[PDB]
Every structure is written in C-alpha cells, then in structure tokens.
Design a protein around this ligand. Structure first.
Ligand SMILES: [Mg+2]
Ligand SMILES: [Zn+2]
Lengths: 52, 134, 196, 190
RNA sequence: GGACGGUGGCCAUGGAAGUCGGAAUCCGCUAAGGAGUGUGUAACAACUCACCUGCCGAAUCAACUAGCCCUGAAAAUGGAU
C-alpha cells in the first residue's frame, strides 16, 4: 500500500541504477565508466532490469 | 455544464458495427447513450464520411447532434473511390481552420503535402488561386 | 543555416528600428507561445514584436547603429530578458493597453507574487468532497447547500513569498483571480530620450 | 604541464570569523564551532579580507590530479560556513509494506532503536556521531530529522541508519522496505 | 518553458494514436515541432527527448593515435629484478 511518492524514493536507491556488464557492480544511473578496478573501468554498462 | 458532457470523439464508420464496434467498449463511460444512444448517432453518422470518421457529438439528453471534423487525410480517402485544387477550395473552409495560422495560403500549403500519402512541386511554386480562399 | 540566421536577424531588426525611430523596450516573463501569439494578434496590424538572442540585438546596435545617430544610449540599457518593441504612437497609447490585456495564466508551483490578492468570504460553488484542501491549509469551511463556503476573513498569500503546493492546487479549482502579470514595459526611447 | 597557479577565493559572511593555524581551519559561528585541518593537501591559505573576509587558497606547480583538491577544499570551507550559520538537517522516510517500522529515540537523540523492520524480532541499535542530534518529527507520519553542524557527520550518521535497514536474500527491487534519506535541507531556513 | 493541423499519416487490423513493423519526410506558425530519439500504455494517455529562447560570461566538444600504469592475468614444499 506504499503510496507512489514514497515508492519513487525507494526505487531511487534500489532500481534507478546502472550495472557493469563485466563485474556486476552497482553504479549511479548517470555513470559512463565503472568505478571498480577489477573490471578495468570498462564502458559496457546496462540499466538495472525492472520487475516488469 | 450544459446538462451533459459528451465532447469525447468517436471513430466508427463504414459498416454499422453496433455490437462489434468500439461503442460497447466505450459504453460504461457515461451510462447515458448505451445501445439506444450510439445507434441513433450511427443512423446519422453512417455517412459523411464512410471512413474511420473521427467525429464529435453534442448530447441533447435523449437525442444527439453529430459534427465531423473534416480530417484532411480522411476526406482524401472519403473522396477517393493530380492537383484537385477545386475540391480543397470548398470543403476546407468549413473546417475550424485554426492551424496557428497568420496568412491566407495556409490551407493550400498544408493539405497539398498532407495528400502525399509527390505533390510538393505544386506546393513550392503555386500561382493559381492565390487569393482563392478569401 | 545558423550563420544566415544571424545575418538575417540583423537585417530585419535594423530595417525595423530605422522604420520606427521611436523605439520602446519591454521585458517578457516566462510566458508561453499563446501569449506571444496574443501580442502578435493584438499588434500585427500596425507593428510587430520579436524574440531572439539578447546579445544579438546589442551587436545589431553596437557598430551598425551608425545609420542614425543619437541611438547609442541603448547599449547599457538592455539587460536581462528584454527586447525591442516598435510602434509609431505616443507614450500613453501603448502603455495603458499593453498593461490592461494581461493574461491571468494562473499560479505555477514556484511563482512570485508581488500583488496582494485576498480570498473573501463567499460560497465557492463546487462539490462537497474536496474539503481536505481547506482543512489542511487552516480554513474552516462549513457545508451550505452542499457547497464549500468561506465563513471568515482568512489570509491567502503575502507579499514577496513563494507559492506552495497546497496553496496553488486549491487556487486552480477555487476559480478565484490570482496575481496577474505579462508583457510589462521597461521604458521608452523617443529619438534620443528616456522616459518612465 | 604544470599550472603556475590555480587559486580559488571563497567569501566569509561577517557574522562568522575564521582563524587559520597552518593548514587547520577554525570556523566560529552562531551555531557552534568547527575545526578541520588540511595537512594532507599541500596548499597555501590566505585571508584577504580585513573588511569583508575573503579567504583564498593557492596551489603552485600542480598537475591535473592536484588542482582538483583546490576546489575540494573550497567546497569543504563552504560546508563549514553553511553548518555554523544554518546547520544541516536531513529528513529520512521509513517505508514499509506490511510490517510498520517502529523507531524509538534514545537519550539526547544520540541513539536510535529500530524495532520491527521487516517483522523480525532483532533490535537494531545504531549510534549517531557525537554532535549529531536525531529526533522523530511531528511534521509527518514517518520522518526522522538529523540535525548537526558537520555535513560529514550528519550524512554519515543518516547513511548508517539506511544501510542498517538492508533487505537480505530477497529481491531488493520488489522488497522496498528500509529507511531512506528524502532531502538534504537546512535549519532556520535563512 | 513550448514538443502545433493533416498526423489515431498509408499498409499491416484484433489495438498498434510518434514510439511492433514494409516504405516514403511535407509545409502556414515561429525561437519550437522530428507524422518522432526513448520510456511507457492491449491502445489511449503521461512525459521526456531535438529545437531554440531567459540568467549564467571563457574556453569547450567529438573521433582518433601511442608512452607509463591498470584490467584482461589460474597450480600445486616457502622464495625470488
Ligand atoms: Mg530466494
Ligand atoms: Zn565494473
């Protein structure tokens, strides 16, 4: 019964994020290169999949 | 509120449809027309035009009056069984003709390319019926 | 085409200021195309108003102003969202008409209110189901004839404040006139003179 | 390439004064006192304003890596000035699906108890940083207010609360429970 | 802030309205309109996008290229510039 305005805030910290394809890190949605060393700061980033 | 609001547009035509049309799918919106309200609109809305017929209606509680916005890409198929500058001269003046326009030749320069579905050479250098509209 | 756009814009504005040496400047608010088309429909019979890049108008009058002298005072007088409106008539002709046909475009979330508007005590006239706006804002409205009714002199908005969410959403449905604004005139320039 | 000088000057309001000892900044304002040193960054600190208190930081012969620290310090000083005159107020909203989150504030607002997160009997005891005051607001149904002088401590304290309420071995996209920061406001709204 | 009429464009039809697709791309208005870059809706709708304007007053952006470094880079007794 979560009303949408609070629902959007929760999804900000849980769904609105980019994912590195090589090391599965969690990145801010506006990122361009992964911040993690072990993936070599690659650029292959995909949006985090939704629940739909 | 004029006792009613039926401003929403209807897009049925050609075959009568009735039961198989979209009107039963839109019926629970207002609860006033039901089977006896859309059919009397269909009785006058069967023609003008015999196409998808994006049209508007005004309700008189029990009765209705229907006016069809003369869509340019609809009336071309409605008149389809070339310039045809004569048929665009008459049927488009009764259109509300807002178009965010300022000049007179807006209608001819608009529909002359809306009929492309090329009639653009007539658009570029047009000289017959320059002051035809007023 | 951008360079030709710049050259064309100088040409039209310089054949319009030379046409109208009596030149007025006006500061437009964050207004939509309807109100630009409103002044266009209300003035195109004898004049025209245009919008463009602010630096462009200064460059059109920086070295190319020399066609007619005594116009040089316009450089330090054009700042902010202001332009040039050209007309042939006297000082009082355009000021009263342009400041009278102000479109009440309602209050957006985050609008300034220099004008004081106070809600009176009257019957609102809408349904008895949206009392949550009045109860949360501090106004006690009692149901009379199934209608919301303001029963007391209550403040609505101060001077020099910012409209809130609950302050604006009730303002839209209440059908009460809010603060108005529009194409407010800055000043004039009557061939080498500046007046209020 | 080594840039000769990359300076950046901040402005100090007259109601607050700054005294510099080496690379240690002492900020003394109406809402309290803030000290933070910058010995780890090789910069030159100068006070320009005997009249309006302009503070200037300088870096001589730096590479692209270390010119970034110049404004990093400047933002830190602006945060210090902001804290000692306005203070940082963080609003956290507790969101839940079936198990309502119960929050109890302990002594002086320095300790927070979370009782029924996701309906588990474990009791979470998160301790705030010193100088950070937390409280349950009266403004809304579910709001926690964190007020303190340093944005460093306050945001760290708030993030500790948020990270504590973390769902485990579940689909975090569907299970939306947890206390999340809503906005980063100020106090006294000046 | 605007994202205009044909335009719910044609043909696919059981919806494909700008966004599933086979193809053509136009103007009166303007600083704005792309019959639509995307999400999304059975479809609507809802935005946003490209397009400029208002403050904002000095350099910025893109594609490359090769030096160092990083990732790519996992084996068994504890050890090798
Ligand atoms: Mg599982
Ligand atoms: Zn990575």
């Amino acid at each position: 019964i979560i009303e949408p305005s609070l629902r959007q805030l929760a999804q900000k910290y849980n769904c609105d994020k980019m994912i590195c394809r090589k090391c599965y890190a969690r990145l801010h949605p506006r990122a361009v290169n992964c911040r993690k060393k072990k993936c070599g700061h690659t650029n292959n980033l995909r949006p985090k999949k939704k629940v739909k | 509120p004029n006792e009613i609001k039926v401003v929403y547009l209807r897009c049925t035509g050609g075959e009568v449809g009735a039961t198989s049309a979209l009107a039963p799918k839109i019926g629970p919106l207002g609860l006033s027309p039901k089977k006896v309200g859309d059919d009397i609109a269909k009785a006058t809305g069967d023609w003008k035009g015999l196409r998808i017929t994006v049209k508007l209606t005004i309700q008189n509680r029990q009765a209705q009056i229907e006016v069809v916005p003369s869509a340019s890409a609809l009336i071309i198929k409605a008149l389809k069984e070339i310039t045809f500058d004569e048929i665009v001269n008459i049927a488009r003046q009764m259109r509300h003709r807002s178009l965010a326009r300022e000049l007179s030749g807006t209608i001819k320069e608009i529909l002359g390319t809306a009929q492309s579905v090329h009639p653009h050479d007539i658009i570029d250098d047009i000289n017959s019926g320059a002051v035809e509209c007023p | 085409d951008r360079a030709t756009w710049k050259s064309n814009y100088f040409l039209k504005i310089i054949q319009l200021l030379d046409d109208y040496p009596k030149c007025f400047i006006v500061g437009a608010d964050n207004v939509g195309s309807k109100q630009m088309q409103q002044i266009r429909m209300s003035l195109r019979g004898k004049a025209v108003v245009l919008m463009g890049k602010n630096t462009m108008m200064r460059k059109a009058i920086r070295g190319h102003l020399e066609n007619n002298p005594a116009l040089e005072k316009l450089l330090p007088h054009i700042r902010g969202n202001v332009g040039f409106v050209f007309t042939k008539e006297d000082l009082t002709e355009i000021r009263d008409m342009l400041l009278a046909n102000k479109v009440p475009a309602a209050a957006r979330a985050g609008a300034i209110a220099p004008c004081e508007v106070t809600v009176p005590a009257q019957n609102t006239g809408l349904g008895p189901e949206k009392t949550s706006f009045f109860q949360a804002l501090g106004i006690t409205t009692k149901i009379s004839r199934g209608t919301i009714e303001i029963l007391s002199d209550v403040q609505l908005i101060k001077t020099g404040d910012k409209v809130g969410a609950s302050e604006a959403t009730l303002l839209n449905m209440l059908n009460i006139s809010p603060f108005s604004f529009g194409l407010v005139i800055q000043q004039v320039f009557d061939n080498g003179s500046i007046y209020n | 390439m080594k840039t000769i000088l990359s300076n950046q000057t901040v402005d100090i309001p007259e109601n607050v004064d700054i005294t510099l000892k080496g690379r240690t900044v002492i900020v003394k304002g109406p809402r309290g006192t803030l000290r933070r040193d910058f010995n780890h960054i090789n910069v030159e600190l100068s006070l320009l304003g005997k009249k309006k208190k302009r503070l200037r930081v300088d870096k001589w012969w730096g590479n692209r890596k270390e010119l970034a620290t110049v404004r990093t310090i400047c933002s830190h000083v602006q945060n210090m000035i902001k804290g000692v005159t306005l203070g940082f107020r963080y609003k956290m909203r507790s969101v839940y699906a079936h198990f309502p989150i119960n929050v109890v504030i302990q002594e002086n607002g320095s300790l927070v108890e979370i009782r029924n997160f996701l309906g588990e009997k474990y009791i979470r005891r998160v301790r705030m940083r010193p100088g950070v005051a937390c409280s349950v607001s009266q403004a809304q149904k579910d709001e926690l207010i964190l007020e303190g002088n340093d944005i460093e401590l306050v945001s760290n304290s708030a993030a500790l609360i948020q990270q504590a309420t973390t769902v485990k071995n579940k689909d975090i996209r569907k299970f939306l429970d947890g206390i999340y920061v809503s906005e980063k406001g100020t106090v006294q709204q000046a």
